[PDB]
Amino acid sequence: KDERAREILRGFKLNWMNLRDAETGKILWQGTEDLSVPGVEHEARVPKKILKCKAVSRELNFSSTEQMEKFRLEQKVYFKGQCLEEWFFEFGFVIPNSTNTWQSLIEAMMPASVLTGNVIIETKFFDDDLLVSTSRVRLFYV
């Protein structure tokens, strides 16, 4: 289990990520940094108006050398160490040596001036019941 988790991680790469306004389709944020990498506190600077969005459409582009049965994410939104939201997203079967674009809808308030730099998204990378990695991104609302 521990060796299999390391094998998946060594062959996994997040190529890019975008955030779109679900109604207009306009990109609010886009990045090329691999935010999935564990042990490093990543940072993202998003427009403060994202908090006014009813729904946000996220696209994740990832590559994986290893086959996966049920690639899925558990995400917790922490504000000053307090969990505000818990999200669950399921991709499913990952064909070995493939690159995939995964689209997910995130549905929605505290002011941006307080949230900025104080919000952490904790992402747990799972294949079925196997925890592959845990990564974190600190959010800035500017």
Binding site: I27, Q30, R45
Partner: protein, 362 residues
């Protein structure tokens, strides 16, 4: 080593490799203009060359891609042109040339590139409106907003107007330069994130944009008219410079420095527990100190003194205040950059998570 003319110093997140100490210069060339956006930076040199670095996620560096950049990079495409000025917004860059051409690259969601559309670009595209007739004195750019100020005092703005931040009244946005006039020559322009301000030749300050957090410096009864430029009459003395940040504004007069808006990180410089003000307040701490230049980041501020010393205040994250390598604390009063005490600070620009300084040693 470093030439007698000095070096460019970077603080905070410039996205350089490691290491890469955060200091550079140019062979037989000198920096003449600095600009910083939310996550990127521009350096214009005396040989009329343009160097870009920082984030390239929207193609705001104009290098022909959206790939990561980890060092100052010369814009090859603009080499036939004589680059004079640059402005960096949230996700876009504006450039003006001596021959009369103005160029733009990067994000374009609200028409901030001035190209007549909303499609993002990764190379510098000419804005056809501007010709050799328009002698550009100053460029400015905020969050999806753009501005150009000419030598004879005409102001042109474009991009987002959803909160009145480009002063075009009822219009939601424009994708081409539009003139903003109150019937007076404009001497200074600053585009903040969601608000903008200009100074007239007779020393009057005009503000417009999002009527939130007190950043316009206007009394309550005038906040409804935020979509058109309005006079800040509460400042009695003649205004010389204005710098607009994320949620705050900084004003230089021939008597004092004024700040207003949000200051939860110390960016107002008005003391440890003064978190905000809706009316302009004098920074009393530097009342005896003459200030020659003001610069505004998203949530920090820099001031160059009469003799080329620098004071900074605001959010200290990643060392962007330029005070110490180990210090990342927020500063609520203007604090001397003692690391530059043996230096003349000649140019400064403040971004979202970084600051760029041109300084020369004694």
């Amino acid at each position: 080593l470093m030439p007698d003319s000095g070096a460019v110093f970077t603080f905070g997140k410039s996205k350089f490799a490691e290491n890469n100490p955060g200091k550079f210069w140019f062979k037989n060339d000198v920096p003449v203009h600095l600009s910083c956006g939310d996550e990127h930076s521009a350096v214009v040199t005396g040989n009329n060359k343009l160097y870009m670095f920082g984030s390239n996620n929207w193609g705001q560096l104009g290098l022909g891609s959206k790939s990561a950049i980890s060092k100052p990079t010369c814009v090859k495409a603009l080499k036939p042109e004589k680059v004079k000025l640059a402005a960096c917004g949230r996700n876009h860059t504006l450039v003006s040339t001596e021959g009369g051409n103005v160029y733009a690259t990067g994000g374009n969601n609200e028409g901030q590139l001035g190209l007549g559309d909303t499609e993002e670009r990764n190379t510098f595209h000419v804005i056809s409106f501007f010709t050799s007739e328009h002698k550009i004195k100053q460029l400015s750019a905020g969050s999806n907003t753009s501005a150009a100020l000419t030598e004879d005092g005409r102001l042109f703005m474009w991009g987002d107007n959803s909160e009145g931040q480009i002063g075009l009244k009822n219009v939601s946005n424009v994708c081409v330069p539009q003139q903003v006039t109150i019937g007076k020559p404009v001497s200074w322009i600053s585009c903040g994130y969601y608000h903008s301000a200009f100074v007239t030749t007779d020393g009057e300050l005009y503000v417009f944009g999002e009527p939130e957090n007190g950043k316009l410096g206007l009394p309550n009864q005038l906040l409804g008219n935020h979509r058109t430029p309005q006079l800040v009459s509460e400042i009695p003395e003649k205004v010389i410079q204005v710098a607009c940040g994320g949620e705050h504004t900084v004003v230089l007069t021939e008597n004092a420095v004024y700040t207003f808006g949000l200051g939860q990180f110390g960016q107002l410089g008005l003391g440890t527990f003064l978190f905000e003000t809706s009316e302009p307040k004098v920074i009393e701490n530097i009342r005896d100190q003459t200030i020659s230049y003001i610069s505004c980041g998203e949530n920090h501020t820099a001031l160059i003194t009469d003799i080329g010393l620098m004071y900074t205040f605001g959010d200290g994250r990643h060392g962007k205040l330029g005070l110490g390598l180990e210090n990342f604390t927020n500063h609520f009063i203007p604090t001397l950059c003692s690391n530059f005490l043996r230096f003349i600070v000649k140019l400064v620009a403040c971004g979202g998570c970084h600051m760029v300084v041109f300084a020369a040693p004694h």
